[PDB]
Symmetry: C3
Subunit: 350 residues, 3 copies
């Protein structure tokens, strides 16, 4: 009855490049867990080297129970140092007949708890890295409508010590709250450094917060890897969409970006370690209907390269094309769709 | 092997009424998760308009590992305003050879975080509403036995800043603790405003606490809807019971109450949005044995009305009777029994 | 396809003894959830009466993604009172080319929240007991290498109020964090009472913390039972090991120790109530692949004794040997492997 069907493919560049074409599609006839359905959404992310600044753009469109929403954001981003990154951007959103814009500037500092060479040198592929990452943000929003004015007013009301504590249940709406802990993540109370109305009027807020993780949170544990600006030698982009309702879900992703593979040391490369948050959080919705898997993965290496290690083992190979399907691989698929994080490692070399 | 069999039926009143007869029965041959079994329980709730005060009564009987417990409570309840409700009641409990009574008075204030007409007007059927709800309670208990005297004494011992913090692991015993977070809920430390012995002696405590939610907690997000006193034009009641052991669980619910359907706007009505907490919390015990579903739902509309929208679609219809079974519906059943919250919406009209 | 096969056996001593031989083996062809695989581990625990002091030894060996680790610890332990236990020990660990030793002394105080005879006398087999357990620790570690010196230095840096708060995401690495709450457990911020370098140099730290639980945490709720020093009339030990990878997991446990059975009152004895933490925490990894069960349990009573109550019922019996397999028992197996805590009670008598 219930079969999840999906197909993935990755085509890698070789040489120095970490770039890969990634394609994914899935279809499964189970209800989505969204308490308002149908829900559809499309997203697209582009990143282009400006000059080491990256202009990163996002556009998101969705319809939730027939209501249309959008979000657009364009941000320039750059690292000041290995621990500190800055961004400046602007964007807007719309929900049905309402919309508003914003602009902001910010800084983020990532900090690992307690780096040690004893670890560095003994663990070939480290995974959990605990740390805390501090956000400092300045944002402005034109109060060009009564809702905005109204909302700014109520915030000012609320803005004592409870404010920055209690805001958390407001910010991580619905099931988002509960996911924080599931990820071994933590969100600090927020601190408002200032809040004012500037010349129409603009509401301007300066505030901060930090989030931490015990190692599963990839945003902290893989801070540098997740922003591979040094390989961004041409535009990258990724697009995805899903349609979902009480009968099924289907989804398509396609993109071209760097970071798909990574040096693994000793002449070898790997497909990058699977990010853990996506597994753990999708693990919260993946266990609601039993299903069988009808899945395939195709990996096409760059010319001349061969897979040196794969567990689960690929099923077939020809020249640079490798395919996985059935067996342990299908068991792994099921496992990860339900929230499992077992390693599926693929190393290759020339 | 493992089949959950269940049957549900709802018979609605028409016109202005939101009332419905609700019947439900389930049987499944899997062990309950209770670490003491067998466990049986029966509960009954009545609500009668006094005058806009409601007298609400609860009687609960259970046997846990052969020990008998009971609980009875009668409370008069009323809203002062849309945000503030008050109650006054009394009751008692028994556990094996021990029992004690109590009486109390209290007030509860519900507060939504940050209502906006921009939302109000754009979202036709809103679901997650974040908020915090403040309880203020005065309770008295006759210290008519040595256990009571003893317990009051130890509380007074404990009553520094830790007290109201640490009490939480005491209050949400066993797996109840962990469920708070699963629900995106939060419970504040308690504050004891006063504690005294009044003329035999009576221990009297005045204390408070608040609980919050990110929108899944229906108690906050659906504060007003959950107390449909305005439709309580005659007594309402509901009764349920379950028997459970290491081999199976069976349960029966039957009731007649208002609030089963609701105006949905535009001439339409709906069966009320499914409350989310019950799904999410039963989701914590629903994934321990695989099972197949053998389920049916029968909805009988009021004369003359027809279903205008149902997803998943009903399976058969005749005159005012509609039935769901198999297919997407059975998949939805499974989904919700495991902790899923996908919408199953049913709208009808004349 | 996916079958978990396992076999358990328990051979009990009779008379006054609570001792039992426990054997367990499992094999299942699903990927482990460890994000680095393969991972293998072996552990052995011995406990010997010194004089009421127990010398307890642990040796753990593992290989994680080809890196070898070890841990050895020998501790003498004793109860001062029913609430307070003390330990003194020493040990060391190694990770690949690095190692370090340590020694410590400590005290642990367990405290139940609010004991009542009204409960004591009415509940024959109590399960959830809320409490908090305070640790006070003194530890020393020779700073005999640069990593150690380096690490001690960074800790001193970090050692304000955040320190003992934030340390938690460091300490409960990866998915360990999230498990605390799943268990209804809580870990307090740590307090450093002192930190110094003593004459090579030795880093010495005195610090404390407490952990609490709502009743599922067995360490608190079963404080005394879990250290059955009074029955330790000869050495006890237990050994276990597992091998795991992306294709399967296999595990073996074998041991001889007291505490396997317990007086149940009224001439009866029981196999001890199943500890709940192991179920709840393994529940976090047990739901990632569907499987069928191929399991058996054999219990061999002491001569002359008979099972007076078993639910689920045993399948076959002969003389003192009882066997469970299939049916409700297999359903129970599945249930507990997925995180279920339903009671499987076995009482016997002569
Ligand atoms: C029965 C098991 C089914 C299954 C059952 C479910 C169910 C049930 C559902 C999904 C859902 C999803 N599934 Mg699944 N799914 C299966 C297998 C798959 C497979 C596959 C085989 O390859 C795929 C590709 C998917 C893909 C998906 C997505 C389409 C969707 C999660 C959307 C998303 O990422 O939300 C990401 C959302 C967020 C990140 C949250 C945003 C909000 C919070 C408030 C924001 C805070 C984050 C932070 C603030 C952001 C700010 C950062 C900026 C830097 C400022 N499923 C299996 C086989 N799947 C869910 C869904 O949406 O369906 C539509 C769902 O309900
Ligand atoms: C403001 C956001 C941060 C950032 C935050 C993160 C986080 C956080 C992560 C990544 C991860 C990755 N990012 Mg980064 N990333 C940024 C900008 C960049 C830029 C760039 C030069 O601008 C590039 C090239 C990348 C590229 C990379 C890849 C190295 C890696 C994804 C690998 C993969 O296979 O994807 C293939 C993609 C898929 C199989 C599915 C993609 C589907 C959709 C299209 C992405 C939506 C994700 C999410 C579920 C929904 C977002 C909801 C938001 C609330 C709106 N990032 C900026 C600086 N990046 C991930 C990783 O694994 O890092 C180690 C990860 O966890
Ligand atoms: C439920 C299904 C699992 C999943 C199961 C699989 C499987 C199975 C495999 C991989 C594999 C890979 N995965 Mg994965 N993967 C998930 C999510 C991600 C995310 C992410 C940011 O969410 C990242 C960056 C990756 C990273 C990648 C690479 C490490 C690797 C090669 C890419 C690939 O095959 O993509 C395939 C593309 C997908 C799996 C699509 C995932 C789409 C996710 C669900 C998000 C969709 C967002 C939605 C469109 C937008 C919502 C936005 C709104 C705000 C709500 N996965 C989801 C959670 N992934 C392959 C691998 O290991 O090769 C060695 C592989 O075999
Ligand atoms: C394998 C999957 C099985 C399944 C496996 C399980 C398992 C396993 C169990 C159940 C259990 C339950 N299942 Mg189920 N169940 C299935 C499908 C069903 C179906 C169906 C098909 O229609 C139904 C109707 C049920 C019904 C039930 C109930 C009989 C029971 C939850 C009792 C309850 O609500 O506790 C509500 C309890 C509370 C609210 C907690 C009270 C204590 C805390 C401390 C109180 C705090 C709340 C707050 C303080 C209250 C104060 C408020 C006042 C205003 C002052 N199951 C599926 C098909 N089900 C559980 C059970 O009890 O079985 C007996 C359980 O163990
Ligand atoms: C002190 C308690 C509060 C209160 C708290 C809540 C909460 C909280 C909720 C409701 C919900 C509802 N309540 Mg109200 N409710 C109160 C008094 C009222 C009165 C009244 C006039 O006195 C009435 C008529 C109602 C009626 C309603 C319905 C609108 C709705 C249930 C719909 C349904 O289909 O049920 C059909 C019933 C079933 C299918 C199963 C019922 C089974 C058993 C019999 C109920 C036990 C529930 C729970 C699991 C066990 C309780 C454990 C306690 C610890 C002891 N409430 C008082 C003021 N009410 C629910 C909802 O959906 O609101 C939007 C909900 O979440
Ligand atoms: C595990 C099974 C799921 C469940 C699955 C279903 C299914 C499936 C459907 C509904 C449907 C409905 N559910 Mg539901 N529903 C659950 C719990 C609830 C609760 C509640 C207070 O717990 C409420 C008020 C409702 C509300 C209702 C309505 C929205 C709707 C019409 C009523 C109906 O069919 O009832 C049916 C009656 C039940 C499902 C019985 C549920 C009994 C719950 C488990 C509590 C029993 C308490 C026990 C006897 C007392 C314990 C007290 C002690 C303190 C421990 N459900 C439980 C958690 N529900 C129907 C719908 O959507 O129509 C459009 C439908 O098809
Ligand atoms: C699909 C369902 C499968 C299944 C899927 C999984 C998956 C998936 C996994 C396991 C894993 C495990 N399974 Mg299982 N498993 C199944 C059924 C079984 C059966 C059986 C049928 O009898 C058995 C015996 C096992 C046995 C096991 C173990 C080999 C392993 C958990 C190791 C451990 O305890 O970590 C205990 C670990 C800790 C306690 C944490 C240590 C770290 C934290 C930081 C320490 C803090 C604690 C505290 C600080 C300690 C200090 C105290 C001192 C007093 C100072 N599984 C079912 C049938 N199983 C997991 C594993 O490891 O596999 C290798 C895993 O990934
Ligand atoms: C410093 C640790 C504490 C302690 C902490 C605990 C905790 C905590 C628990 C026990 C439990 C038990 N302990 Mg004690 N225990 C200590 C010392 C003792 C001594 C002794 C005289 O020295 C003895 C005889 C026992 C014996 C007992 C039994 C009564 C019972 C296990 C019953 C069983 O069937 O096991 C059969 C064993 C198995 C079926 C599987 C055993 C597999 C492996 C070999 C044990 C590893 C467990 C864990 C998953 C991995 C440890 C990871 C650490 C981070 C390194 N403990 C010391 C004082 N003990 C458990 C219980 O049920 O208590 C009520 C429990 O929860
Ligand atoms: C996933 C499987 C479940 C499990 C399912 C079963 C089943 C099924 C049954 C019992 C039964 C028993 N279990 Mg149990 N049990 C689990 C874990 C434990 C733990 C523990 C400290 O972890 C304890 C002390 C016990 C206690 C015992 C007894 C109460 C009872 C008689 C012993 C027996 O049959 O052992 C059997 C031995 C096992 C089940 C092996 C469990 C090994 C656990 C997973 C830990 C392995 C640690 C690993 C080797 C080291 C990791 C260390 C590193 C730090 C990571 N179980 C694990 C979590 N248990 C039997 C019973 O109820 O009889 C009445 C029975 O039928």
């Amino acid at each position: 009855t219930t079969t999840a069907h999906s197909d993935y493919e990755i085509i890698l560049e070789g040489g120095s490049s970490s770039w890969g074409q990634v394609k994914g599609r899935a279809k499964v006839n189970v209800p989505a867990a969204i308490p308002l359905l149908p829900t559809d959404c499309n997203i697209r992310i582009d990143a282009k080297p400006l000059d080491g600044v990256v202009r990163f753009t996002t556009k998101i469109e969705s319809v939730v129970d027939s209501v249309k929403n959008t979000l657009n954001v364009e941000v320039d981003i750059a690292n000041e140092t290995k621990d500190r990154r800055i961004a400046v951007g602007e964007g807007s959103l719309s929900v049905g007949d309402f919309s508003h814009s914003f602009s902001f500037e910010g800084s983020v500092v990532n900090m690992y708890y307690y780096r040690s060479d004893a670890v560095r040198r003994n663990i070939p592929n480290p995974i959990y890295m605990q740390g805390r990452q501090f956000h400092d943000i300045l944002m402005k929003v034109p109060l060009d409508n009564n809702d905005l004015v109204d909302t700014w007013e109520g915030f000012q009301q609320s803005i004592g010590a409870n404010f920055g504590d209690w805001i958390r249940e407001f910010w991580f709406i619905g099931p988002a709250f509960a996911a924080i802990n599931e990820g071994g993540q933590r969100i600090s109370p927020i601190v408002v450094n200032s809040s004012n109305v500037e010349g129409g009027p603009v509401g301007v807020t300066r505030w901060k917060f930090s989030h931490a993780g015990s190692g599963v949170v990839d945003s902290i544990s893989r801070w540098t890897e997740l922003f591979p600006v040094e390989q961004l030698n041409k535009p990258a982009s990724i697009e995805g969409g899903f349609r979902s309702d009480s009968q099924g879900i289907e989804v398509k992703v396609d993109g071209n970006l760097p970071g798909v593979s990574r040096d693994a040391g000793g002449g070898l490369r790997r497909i990058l370690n699977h990010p853990l948050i996506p597994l753990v959080h999708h693990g919260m919705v993946g266990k609601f209907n039993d299903f069988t898997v009808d899945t395939q993965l195709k990996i096409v290496l760059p010319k001349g390269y061969k897979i040196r290690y794969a567990a689960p083992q690929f099923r077939s190979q020809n020249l640079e094309e490798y395919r996985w399907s059935g067996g342990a691989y299908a068991r792994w698929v099921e496992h990860v769709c339900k929230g499992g994080t077992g390693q599926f490692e693929v190393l290759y070399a020339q």
